Design a binder for this molecule. Structure first.
Ligand SMILES: CC(C)C[C@H](NC(=O)[C@H](C)NP(=O)(O)CNC(=O)OCc1ccccc1)C(=O)O
Ligand SMILES: [Ca+2]
Ligand SMILES: [Ca+2]
Ligand SMILES: [Ca+2]
Ligand SMILES: [Ca+2]
Ligand SMILES: [Zn+2]
Length: 316
């Protein structure tokens, strides 16, 4: 909507107060004009028609329980925008400042979040398995990263290309979590998963096997559930990414870590310059090795460590 840019205040899903960029025109809307062509957050009102209505508030104060998932969807989309722009010089998911749209309160008891081809969508969870999923900055950045992938490599969402698609979203969701630097970790979704159980997560990048997922190509899933295991076989690439950044010895193979920023640079370059819709895991290795060669030189430590990491997870 046309209006004037304002700053609202509210509380997110976990009870933290934060400022949000809004737009005033009769109501205060969750429309952030300070980032590209806008960040826009909508109310799906427990239904499944999308996007629903642009979020409207009478007084620019967002402290109701019902407000909290919108506060966080809106705010964390802003953080993710800033990450891509400041770290990778990328303007929104299309590189041309496309408007970022999110809907919250999608459906009833909905234990998931997704990118539907055009926008981000967040369930509230059933209150047992999940609390509102936009409370997880890694989840919001995971979702926005699906849009980045679709506009760049275009990795098909099945089998190995789909597992790379998933891992790219977990990798940048985690790098955004570290960028924001509030309780960052290599786990996915810990802030919104199972509020009555402490210390668990949807997935772990450091030890994928803790939550059922393979950490080596020899343990890859090859059945048809989950689009050919895209959220399962993602553990093999997540483990490789973790090793590249943090180092370790895995199945007897030692990897010298090179840190988060170089991990992010290598995979951002791979994603945008080398991967294709049908890339498999071996082609991702090649893409990562070439990206690291471009950035740091064919004899660099960084190239050695990417090779080490893919060796450790069995991907040649
Ligand atoms: C328990 C559940 C949240 C675990 C998992 N989901 C995730 O890890 C994250 C949060 N969501 P996501 O973006 O990967 C789900 N994606 C998804 O449903 O893709 C299907 C799709 C939806 C819309 C258009 C095209 C394809 C999953 O969907 O299995
Ligand atoms: Ca209000
Ligand atoms: Ca965390
Ligand atoms: Ca996390
Ligand atoms: Ca939990
Ligand atoms: Zn995903």
């Amino acid at each position: 909507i046309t209006g004037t840019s304002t700053v609202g205040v509210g509380r997110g899903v976990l009870g933290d107060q934060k400022n949000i960029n809004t737009t005033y025109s009769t109501y205060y809307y969750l429309q952030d004009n300070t980032r590209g062509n806008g960040i826009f957050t909508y109310d799906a009102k427990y239904r499944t028609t999308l996007p629903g209505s642009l979020w409207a508030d009478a007084d620019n104060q967002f402290f109701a329980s019902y407000d909290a998932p919108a506060v966080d969807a809106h705010y964390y989309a802003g953080v993710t925008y800033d990450y891509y722009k400041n770290v990778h010089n990328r303007l929104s998911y299309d590189g041309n400042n496309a408007a970022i749209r999110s809907s919250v309160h999608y459906s009833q008891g909905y234990n998931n979040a997704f990118w539907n081809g055009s926008q981000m969508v967040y369930g509230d969870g059933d209150g047992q398995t999940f609390i509102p999923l936009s409370g997880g900055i890694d989840v919001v950045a995971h979702e926005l990263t699906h849009a980045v992938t679709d506009y760049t490599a275009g990795l098909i969402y099945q089998n190995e290309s789909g597992a790379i698609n998933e891992a790219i979203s977990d990798i940048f969701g985690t790098l955004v979590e570290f960028y924001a630097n509030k309780n960052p970790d290599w786990e996915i979704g810990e802030d919104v998963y199972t509020p009555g159980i402490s210390g668990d997560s949807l997935r772990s990048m450091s030890d994928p096997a803790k939550y059922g997922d393979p950490d080596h190509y020899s343990k890859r899933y090859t059945g048809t559930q989950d689009n050919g295991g895209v959220h399962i076989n993602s553990g093999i690439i997540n483990k490789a990414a973790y090793l590249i950044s943090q180092g370790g010895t895995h199945y007897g193979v030692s990897v010298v870590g090179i840190g988060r920023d170089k991990l992010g640079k290598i995979f951002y370059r791979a994603l945008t310059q080398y991967l294709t819709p049908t890339s498999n895991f071996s082609q991702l290795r090649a893409a990562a090795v070439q990206s690291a060669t471009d950035l740091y030189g064919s004899t660099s430590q960084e190239v050695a460590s990417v090779k080490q990491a893919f060796d450790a997870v069995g991907v040649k």
